[PDB]
Amino acid sequence: RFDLVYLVLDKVDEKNDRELAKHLTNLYLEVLPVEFLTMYISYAKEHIHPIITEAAKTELVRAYVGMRKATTRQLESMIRLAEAHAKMKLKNVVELEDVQEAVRLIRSAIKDYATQTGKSVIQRKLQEDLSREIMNVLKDQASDSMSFNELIKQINEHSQDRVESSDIQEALSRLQQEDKVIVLGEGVRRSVRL
Amino acid sequence: RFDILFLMLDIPSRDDDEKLAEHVTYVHMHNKQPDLDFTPVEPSKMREYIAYAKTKRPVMSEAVNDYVVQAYIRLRQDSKREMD
Numbered sequence: 001r002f003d004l005v006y007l008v009l010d011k012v013d014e015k016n017d018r019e020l021a022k023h024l025t026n027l028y029l030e031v032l033p034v035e036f037l038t039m040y041i042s043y044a045k046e047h048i049h050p051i052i053t054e055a056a057k058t059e060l061v062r063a064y065v066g067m068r069k070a071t072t073r074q075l076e077s078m079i080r081l082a083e084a085h086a087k088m089k090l091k092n093v094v095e096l097e098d099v100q101e102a103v104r105l106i107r108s109a110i111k112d113y114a115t116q117t118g119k120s121v122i123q124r125k126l127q128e129d130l131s132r133e134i135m136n137v138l139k140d141q142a143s144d145s146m147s148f149n150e151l152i153k154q155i156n157e158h159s160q161d162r163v164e165s166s167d168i169q170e171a172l173s174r175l176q177q178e179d180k181v182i183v184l185g186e187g188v189r190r191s192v193r194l
Numbered sequence: 195r196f197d198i199l200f201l202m203l204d205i206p207s208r209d210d211d212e213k214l215a216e217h218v219t220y221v222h223m224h225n226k227q228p229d230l231d232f233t234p235v236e237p238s239k240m241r242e243y244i245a246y247a248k249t250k251r252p253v254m255s256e257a258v259n260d261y262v263v264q265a266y267i268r269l270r271q272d273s274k275r276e277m278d
Contacts, residue, residue: 017266
């Protein structure tokens with residue numbers, strides 16, 4: 001529902017934090033209008049409603065086909081601020097080179113995501129090995145009995161790639177939906193049979 | 195959004211507390227609490243001193259802002275050492 005985000009940065013940054021001190025060193029001792037720009041935009045929002053030509057769409061598809069190398073949420077909003085920047089700097093008509101600053105801001109938008117919710121790298125491995133730890137003991141045990149003291153002492157220490165209790169409780173609610181197991185308190189369970 | 199903090203933690207310490215014991219027991223046999231060679235001051239006097247001090251508002255020089263930019267750098271570096 002939002003189009004592009006940004007994060008502000010921070011570090012020690014000794015050449016810049018010293019420079020930021022120089023700003024606050026000043027502004028204590030001793031055209032940038034207050035109304036002229038305000039009437040400049042409030043005229044310029046509803047009077048001229050600008051156009052769109054082929055000169056933008058040819059470069060526009062040239063951006064996304066390399067971008068595919070979201071789907072269309074990013075595509076709908078990417079023209080709107082491209083339109084408004086053409087509406088701002090040239091209060092007449094469309095621009096063809098207004099899109100390099102469109103791709104300037106959104107390329108900085110995707111810089112914030114280099115590094116579960118929109119990601120599946122942990123989710124291509126967590127559903128696999130948890131589909132393995134059922135089939136082994138269910139081929140050892142003639143019953144479907146699996147108590148709580150066994151599962152803490154089986155799957156917390158086979159591998160150290162999974163968290164202890166933050167995701168093992170939600171690991172079983174999907175198996176509650178996928179015709180495997182049932183819940184009977186913080187103890188005994190009941191598993192799948194053939 | 196604040197600037198400074200304090201604390202009122204209690205550590206066991208023998209010499210202070212017996213002095214603190216005489217501190218609280220002295221107020222019962224008599225009724226007066228003053229001591230320790232301090233002449234007590236009327237609150238109107240400092241109130242006039244505050245109100246006179248509130249009518250000055252001095253303006254800083256340049257060497258002070260030169261001394262705080264080096265202060266903030268030395269404030270920046272050690273705070274960026276712990277990270278704990």
